[model samples]
Structures are given as C-alpha cells and as structure tokens.
Target chain A: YVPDMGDLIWVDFDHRPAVVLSPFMYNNKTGMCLCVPCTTQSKGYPFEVVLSGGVALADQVKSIAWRARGATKKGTVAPEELQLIKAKINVLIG
Target chain B: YVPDMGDLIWVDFDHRPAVVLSPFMYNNKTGMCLCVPCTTQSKGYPFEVVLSGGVALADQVKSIAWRARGATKKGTVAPEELQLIKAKINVLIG
Candidate 1:
C-alpha cells in the first residue's frame, strides 16, 4: 500500500538497496511484490533506468513478500522507461 | 571485488535496498551477479531469509549485469544460512 508500481524503494538486502517493480496490491493475503536491484555501472537495455541514471537489474530482480517497512520510498521511473524495463525483463525470462 | 562473497550491501533499486545473492566474480565478461530483495512480511520456505528476517523472492529472481557501485555493502549472511538460500533459489529456478 505504501509503494505503488514503478516506485523506487530501499530493500534491506545484503546491504544494497532494492527497487519495487510491481504495484502494491491489496491482496492482503500475499503482500508480495516485485523489485529490481540497482548498480552503478550501466549494462544497457533493460538493465539500466535510462532516464534516472540508475540501472534496473533486469536479471537480478527480486519478488519481496514482506511489508515495505524500512523501505525508503525513493521514486518511480518514467512510465515509458518503466515499461521498457518490464519488456526487457519479460523477454529475458519469457 | 567490492562485495567479496556473502556480503550485505545497499542497492539503488526503486529506492529500496537490495541484497547481493551471489559473490562478486571477476567474470569481467558479464558483471551480472545474483541478489535477493527483502520484505517485512514473511512467506516461509525459500522466500524468507530466516536468519535476517528478510525474505528472498524465489519467483521474482534476477540476474544483474553491471558494476555494483553506490552499493552500501552492509553485511553478509551466515554460511549455512547462505547455502540454504541458494538451495531454495536453485529449486525454484531449476
């Protein structure tokens, strides 16, 4: 409910910050959502958040199940940009 | 070489912090490594990070390909714990 889709968030993973890929659904039963990791070095295509200078780890993405607590809502990506990222991820996995 | 192996760090994903799932390899060829996202809610089994309270996303896993700069490098997971995490991930993917 806190972070909607395309919103950037800070996940408490390993020490690195993570991103929220999917929107916060009211499923309440399964409070799970998708998020991507960011890296300084750009990897082109779906990996990079072209506009924000932040790279959306298309490959190393995570689907978090816990509440978005401790997650510092950073920001969301451009709609088009976010879609591109999604397309790349789907392509890679699908 | 920033986050050797089993180290925790902060990633710049959507504003959420992500974790480094795999060790930093010299693959120079493809700087892609594995990391899991954390959530406040728990999902049991391969989804939850038992030791750290952070849940790993078995379904929404990613393969990164870039330098992990701006990554905070928080800490690492216990060896046995890490192994359990890997096994769970493998089971989901394989």
Candidate 2:
C-alpha cells in the first residue's frame, strides 16, 4: 500500500470559525467539507497523459494486464480499455 | 479589504481523528493547529517582484509614497531600499 498523506479539512459555510477534522461533532452542525485525499492511491484512479497532473512519460507504469497482453503504447490508455482493466481486476480480487 | 480566499485546515499530532476549526474547543485538548489566512491582505505583506508569487508589473499598483516620490526603476526594488520603504511605512502608520 502507498504511504498516507494527511487528513481533510472542512470549512464552515457561515464564514465562522467552526468545525474541525475531528470525528466528534460537538454541536451536530455540519460544515462545508474540503476532502483532501491523504494517501497516494486514495488520490484516485490514474487518467490520460494530458490530464494526469504533469507526470512524466518515463514514470508511467504498465498495468499488469497490459504487460500480460504485450501491449506497448507511449500515450494514454483509452477510457474503455481502462474500464475493462478495472473490471478484470475487481473480478480477480473477488 | 481584499476578497477572502478561504479557511485553513489543521492536522492532528497523534494521527487520531480529532479537533476541528471550531470557535469552541469542546474537549480543551488543543491538537496541532494549521492556521490558514482567510483574506488576501491578511495573507501578509507584498514583496519584491521576484518573490511576489508571479504577479506581473502591470498588475501591481504603485504605493502612494512611491507615486509621491516618483521613483520609477523597474525589475526589482533593491533590498536596502525595500527595507527603508518598509520602515518609512511603519513610521507613517504608527
């Protein structure tokens, strides 16, 4: 598993100093939440090269299925193909 | 006053889910604090062009004193001159 980053901070809607990252809600009032992902993997699924936050081409890792299938592509994996890979992975894990 | 950017998020010290950005501290257990500046001016003082976070020359309005003095050298303000100006401003404000 990838290393964890940190916690998400939630801000109040009324522009008042209210709400914290704590699990316990004292006043039972929810606030506008800023959901900052703490972990690398938890940052969500990798996307196309153009959309993938400035990551270099050399750093792109071939998925296990791509390696198994002997597919060689320099650029982004098509969306449909990525979905298929995700489905396969889910089935394998199950 | 300049527009408000938003709130700051504070993380906990022990890695446990605790503390929020509330006005009242319910447990009195003040965990680690992350102070986020809400407003732009509250963000702090303006600096020389280099360290001034990519704001262009056209964007920055000349200070009243600078305008009054007619000092029109571009690039960056000399460090000594900057300090002098800062001191003068402080004196004027005080």
Candidate 3:
C-alpha cells in the first residue's frame, strides 16, 4: 500500500521504521517518497527529534523508491509530532 | 567536489541544474544529500519556488547519492532565495 504523510513505514532494506514526509504529489510524480528513519538508540544529536516513542533522525532523511516500501504501514505519527519532525528537517537541510 | 547548502549542482543522471539542501553533516553521515532540481520549464505549480533564474521543484526533491553529484558547482542561490526555497519545501512536505 502507498504511504501518506506522517505514516510510519518500513523500508525493505531497513529493519527499523521511518516517518514519511513527502506529499502525494511527490510520490505520484516520482515513484518515490521522502522519509526520516526512527531509532530507539539516539546520541542526543541536535538533528534528532524525539517522537513516536523513538528518535526521528532528521539527518538521515532520504527518498525511497515505491518498490522499497513495505506492503503495509507500521504506524503513524501524531500531526504535531510530524510538524516538529519537519521543523527539525528544515533546520537540518535549510 | 562535495556540495554544500544553496550550491547549484548538477546530478550525473540529469542534464538540468539542482539546488543542494542537505548539510555537510547529512552528506558525511550518509554519503547522500537532498536536492531540488531547478527547471526553466514550469507549469506554475504551487510547489515551485522561483529562484536562481529557474523554478525550484520542491515536489521533486530527493536524496542524491554522493557519486551522482557533479564535480564542480555551477552557481549559488542568493541567501534570501534559498530561505524562500526552504519555506516552499516546508509547505510541500510539512
């Protein structure tokens, strides 16, 4: 299934979960979506945003091919938490 | 050469220029950098940010592998334009 913004997804190559940040327009156009992987283990790096019972690693954000996405969504992030994650991403890449 | 924020870069796969958004930390950590391609051709989409004499397609932003980057930077976006591009990106994905 296709993931939407804020959905926690599993990339086929990664054992952990990641939060989707790309909007539908991007996925529909490019066959890819942007995501930031989550980890329970964090070093308190400035680029990390605590969210969804783990650390959202903003610095590791990347675009995943649609084929690499899991068949089902693992979970979803709270709207506010997703916004905070986006904010940290902006700081990291802005 | 490694690309830095706001640097106009050419990805090996595309003939068009793109603006680098990923910081050194992300690049060094993942061997990849986020970028939004710039195109003189535009359909006036809401996700497009006008800058560097082209439209920054925020909807098409992606993480480029280090090896895919061009050896030399083509130019730099003005500081204000870069900020605007970031803002548009936030709107697109946030």
Candidate 4:
C-alpha cells in the first residue's frame, strides 16, 4: 500500500530505487534518515515508505522486523519499517 | 503503589533522598539517570522509585509533570515521571 504523504520523510520500500528528502543527511549504508524543519520532527521523526509489487514486497519486509528492533536498541531514532528505505538507497546508489 | 523491579531503574520520588543505578552516568543537575547492563533496559530505559508519605507525594509529583513535559520537548531522553527523581536528586545532592 502507498504510504500517506505528510510531514514524514519518504523512503521507498518497493525493493527498487527510491528517494528521501529531509533536513538531515540520508545515509544508505546505515539507513539513518533525518527529518528536520518541522516541530513534530523532534518526536523521533516518523518515516513512511511507498511499496510497489504488492505481496511480493511482504517477504522482503518481514526480514526487516528484527533489524528494526535491533536498531532501536542501538539508539537509532527512526521508524522500524524504514529499513527498507535504507535497502532501497543502497540498491539504487550502490 | 510499588513499581515492578523486573527490568527497571529505581529513582526515589517521595521528595526525599533517592538513588538510581544503571551503567550510564547519573546527572543530578539535569535529572538524567541512565540504566545500563540490562537486556530490556534498551526499551527507553524504565525507572521507578519508592514513595513516602503517600498523598503528600502527589503535590510534589504534579510540579514534576510540567518539568518532565518540557524536558521531553527539549529532547532530554528521559521519562516524564522521572522529573521527581531529578527534583529529589537536586534537593538531596545539591
């Protein structure tokens, strides 16, 4: 499903190339994206992603659940589902 | 009510002396206490305390509500209720 576009930073999770915009640096290697220029941006900066290929994206998405949980423990302030955004960045840029 | 000790830090909130234990540094000036070395400790680091004088703790507790709200807005990364711990720390340690 396509994510709602609002004050959130967009990261494409369709296992394809995507672009994200924020006031902070977008790092593909670490999947650490920052959202700035908004008041709520300080509240752990929510993120959203657009998914293509419907159910095909589910498997790739499942693997990310654990990674997101691990990342939070490491103090990386981003959404758990945003890992796909990092993967997309790596695939597209790498 | 006493807080569960399963995997949380203890910060006294009875408007008296209190202590917090964790792997991270305890800052009295900023009222920031850290809990390290616990597995579940990573879930934003929970804190608790023993309250004395029952309802008398409530009034002191209310002033802390505002400070805790401001602290989160400033990205201090501590619990909202822990302001009492910080206040107790300042009153005791200061």
Candidate 5:
C-alpha cells in the first residue's frame, strides 16, 4: 500500500505506532519511508510534537521498509499538526 | 559527561549502545545529543554504517538527554567512518 506523508501507521518490527513523514514518491521509489515514532509516554523533549492520540517523537525519526508496516493505516495527521512535527524535525536536523 | 561527535555511548533509556552524532557545543548548550543506535543485527538498509563493534543504524537517529548517557564512553568512531555516517544522515534529512 502507498502511504502518503503524515499518515499514522503501525510499525511491525517494534510493535509501535509511527507517523509516516516521507513523501509518497519517496516510498514508491525506495520501498521505504521515513517516520517519527509516536508515544503516549513523553518526557516533554523539545523536539516532541503533541498529537491527538499521542506525541510524535521527532527526535527519534527513522526509516522503515514498506513490508515492515502493518497492513492498515491508523489515520492521517492533521495538516497543521504535521507541519509542527516537521518543524521540530527541522530544528534538530535541518 | 560531554560527548563529542562520533563518540560511542550507552543509552540508559533503551539499554543499548549508540554513536553520538551531535557536536560538543550542541550537547553542552542543550543538554541533549543526537545519536544513531548500533546493533549487530543487520538488515542491509541503505543508510546503515559499518562499525567495529556493530552497524550504526543511521536510519534510526535520535536525540537523548545528557543525563541519560552512560558515564563512560564506549569509544570514538574513526574519522572516515564518522564521515560516512554523516553522509548517510544527510541523504535522509539534509
């Protein structure tokens, strides 16, 4: 399945939820996508972005293969929330 | 402890070893440092960097507070190896 940017997805390897941050074309071309893991447990790290379900740990950004993704999408991140997540990520790595 | 870029460190939160990637000044100023976790388990990911003890999973780069670091540094990454690690990270987030 093709996952668009800002999609919440289940990561099978770690049995956790993550928000997909890579573009659709990037995933299609490379068979993988970059993502930020989500957590209900947070220490209020400067790079963490609050979301409806939990906080997106932007500091823990990672890439995973499409095959490693759970077969269904959890949901989509709100555009404004997605922008906040990206901004935090940029503060760390941009 | 102040961890310079490319220093191998133990992450207390996850109980795993990681290679520090943030500059010395960055850690000193923010009380947090960026790192890439290392593992013997390899999946041939495009962004993984080979290391003496294990593979540096650049794909899983994260930041941790200095207080969470194990007191003693495990080691320092070679200049060439560190460069390779940064290059892989740039490919993803630069």
Candidate 6:
C-alpha cells in the first residue's frame, strides 16, 4: 500500500525523499495523492524538519505514488514535526 | 469553486501565502482543497520559484479555500515555474 499522511517514503527517481502530506484516503478530484519533497540542502532554513533519516525541508511538494520503486512503506513523519511543518506551510500559504 | 492548480492566491490567516496545486475541480477524498504554502525565507534554496508576488518555496502545502479572503482568484502559478517547481518536488519525493 502507498504511504499515508506524515509518512516518510523514498522513491527510485534518484532516491528523492519526501513526506506524504496527502491524507490516507483517496482524492477523487485530482485523482492523486499529495506529498512534500525534502532536501538535505538545509543551510539557512529555520523550519527545517529533522526526520528519522535526515533534515526534511518542509517547503517542497512532490506528487508521486506507485511510480517510485519500493514497498512504499519505509517510515512516517512525526506528529510534532508534522505540526511544525504544517504551521510553516500555513505561513507560506498566507 | 476554489483556486485551480497553479493558482497563486493569498489567505487572511496572518496573511499567509500559498499556491493552488490541486486541479480546478472537486476533491472528495479529504473534502478539502490542496495547496502549497510559501514563505519569504528563501536564502539557501536552489529550486526557488520567483512568483508574481514572491518566491514560492515549493516545499509546503496548505488545506484551505472558502476560509480565505478575496475572490479566491488572484493570480496563477506560471507554467514554466510550475514545471520547475513540480520537478523539484519530485526530487524531494524521492
């Protein structure tokens, strides 16, 4: 099964790590799940999310599922971390 | 309806900014619109998206629509920019 929200998963497309921001349920409107792409390029970003793997820059969104090679199950984005990331996302949305 | 994919819009909740990445339709999966939150703290980011308003740090998402102010139709995320942003998001997802 694909990863759910707050889930940390990796893809074969250069192993680009990202956090699953879309809910577990299916989105009929777009017919696609949402995700935030992260990078280790954390230098001057304060809202840097330190995941179980590395620092997840919560500013990138990547829409991918079933395209990446893997069981699609690796890890999950922590609640606290997701909360902070969500807050920062709101700042960006405003 | 709400902002369509690649739509640049603003919110009143602290004047937070974001971009509409979802399709110009309906999403019943989560019963919410999907968006990517943006921030001005663009310093070390490489895939920096210079939006009509500000650089959309393509690394965030927000769930909002009717809650925000305005006609909900301010601007649109440029095609080239969205393409670049989508690519970067793919990187983060891997």
TM-score of each: 0.46, 0.14, 0.67, 0.15, 0.60, 0.45
- Of candidate 5 chain B, the 10-residue stretch with the lowest lDDT total is B63-72
DockQ of the two-chain complex in candidate 5: 0.25
Q: Write the per-residue lDDT of candidate 4 for residues A1-94, one digit (tens) a residue.
A: 1111111322334222222222222133333322211121122212234332211121111111212322221112234334555443223211
Clashing pairs in 4: B23-B36
Pick out the ten consecutive residues of candidate 5 chain A with the lowest summed lDDT: A63-72
lDDT of 1 by residue, B1-94 (tens): 4655456556565444455565444323356656555565765543566656465554455555436544666666677766666666544432
lDDT of 3 by residue, B1-94 (tens): 6678889877675477888887866677666788887889768677777774588877566767865554468899888878887787677665
Stretches of candidate 2 off by over 4 Å are A1-20, A33-36, A40-94, B1-35, B39-94
Write out the backbone clash pairs for model 3.
none
Candidate 6 chain A, poorest ten consecutive residues by summed lDDT: A24-33
lDDT (Cα) of model 2: 0.21
lDDT of 3 at B66: 60
lDDT of prediction 5:
0.75
lDDT digits (tens) for residues A5-90 of candidate 2: 11112222321111111122211222112111112232333321222312111111111111122222223333443333333322
DockQ of 1: 0.18
Worst 10 residues of 2 chain A by lDDT: A55-64
The interface RMSD value for candidate 1 stands at 7.3
The list of candidate 4 runs beyond 4 A from truth reads: A1-66, A69-94, B1-8, B11-26, B37-94
Expressed as tens digits, the lDDT of each residue in B1-94 for candidate 6 is: 4556677766655365667755554333323465666666667666478776577765444445434344355677778877777666545432
Winning model by TM-score: 3
Fnat for each model? 0.38, 0.00, 0.54, 0.00, 0.24, 0.03
For model 3, residues A1-94, the per-residue Cα lDDT tens digits are 6778888887776487888898766667667887888889868677777775588877667767865454358888888888888887767665
Give lDDT per model, in order.
0.57, 0.21, 0.76, 0.24, 0.75, 0.59
Task: Give me the candidate number with maximum DockQ.
Answer: 3
lDDT of 5 by residue, B3-83 (tens): 888788875654668887777876887777877788887687777888874888776676678665554588888888888
TM-score, cand. 4: 0.15
